[PDB]
Design a binder for these strands. Sequence first.
RNA 1: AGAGUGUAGCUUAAAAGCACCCAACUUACACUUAGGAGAUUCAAUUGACGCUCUGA
Lengths: 197, 77, 108, 29
Amino acid sequence: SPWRLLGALCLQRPPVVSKPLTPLQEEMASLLQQIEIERSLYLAQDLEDMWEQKFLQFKLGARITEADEKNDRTSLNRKLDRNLVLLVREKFGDQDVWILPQAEWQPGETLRGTAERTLATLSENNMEAKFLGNAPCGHYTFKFLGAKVFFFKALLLTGDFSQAGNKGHHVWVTKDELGDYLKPKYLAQVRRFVSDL
Amino acid sequence: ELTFEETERRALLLKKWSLYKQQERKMERDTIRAMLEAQQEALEELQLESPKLHAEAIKRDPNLFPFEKEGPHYTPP
Amino acid sequence: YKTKPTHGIGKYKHLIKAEDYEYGVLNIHLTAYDMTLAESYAQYVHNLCNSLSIKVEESYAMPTKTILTTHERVVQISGLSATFAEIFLEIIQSSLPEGVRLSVKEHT
Amino acid sequence: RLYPVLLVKQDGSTIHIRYREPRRMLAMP
RNA sequence: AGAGUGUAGCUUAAAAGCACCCAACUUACACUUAGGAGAUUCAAUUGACGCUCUGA
């Protein structure tokens, strides 16, 4: 039977900023600090004042660059405390669905080669990605002539995402907007293999 | 020396962290099972739809031996 | 007794062992600014390993080096499946708390 | 005693460390 | 649309036992000691709320 060969890639951007501590974790931090003080085994004022003013003079880099934008979905720095996933709008001849970046593959090209091609096929940038294994993460088959789509996985080491204002609709989705943007069951189940954490 | 109220608060903190990390390990295990079964059903579908690709799906990428990936920070470059 | 049906009912040494693509010996090196953080992460990774049924051999440490000091830890790992290695490594990546250096180096 | 001192290696990545004599700011040259 | 249907993770357990987590002893694991959380999907053996499979 005529089969429509299609692969894909669920790119993963790891969090550059660790998640902020909950008040429960802050209470545990206080408890561990006080037990550490209890278990501890043995002009300072001027030094403390100088060191605290050294702390005060420099402003710490904001852990959240997200509240100011509210519209920069295309920006690579949409979120910092969580993983990000690339997601680009696509328009087919018979369909128009917000679809994870896919690609067409041939039997002369392996799945790893298809993923490596897809790394720069649609973003036209100099992004640096890393692969773990040939094992995929999700498979979804929708027919009209058979077809299949393989959602793979990759991790971003560094990225020179030039011309961020691309003609595409790349919107970085962490966990929540996946259901909002991908309605059909064949595309709303990506969160099963997306690291929700 | 310590008082009774602080000991009770310590016990409550231990209980609440027990519950919190219990939920943490539970959700981590749920993610593990969910994505593992997703990968297994993906492999089964790949075997069913391609008898010549499941043989090359099991092989490992030889670039993982010098693997390297840094963790998170607070202030990005 | 040898001739009796109950022969060998008391043997035990056969139950004691005193001495398909898979990895080899894997060393995870954890260098950290904090003794407490390094120890906690070593405990966490060891718990993950013995919950996922990973043969862990050693959890030793390198000697301290001064040029402040950085504490080093080692986790030994043996036995990985295709998807199992991927899930293990990605869980480690997503569970690295703060400013710690991982490693997938080998022996020697 | 240990204190939460912020440390930076070469690029400006503040990290909390348990360090004696709370400096609140460290920068490796 | 149809079938299997159904006790917390597992039980030819009947509300239990294993599992599971931290606290201390451990480099660590483990042991031990202290603690912690848990279910028989809703109505009368039956019907309908949820899961898996077979299709579009």
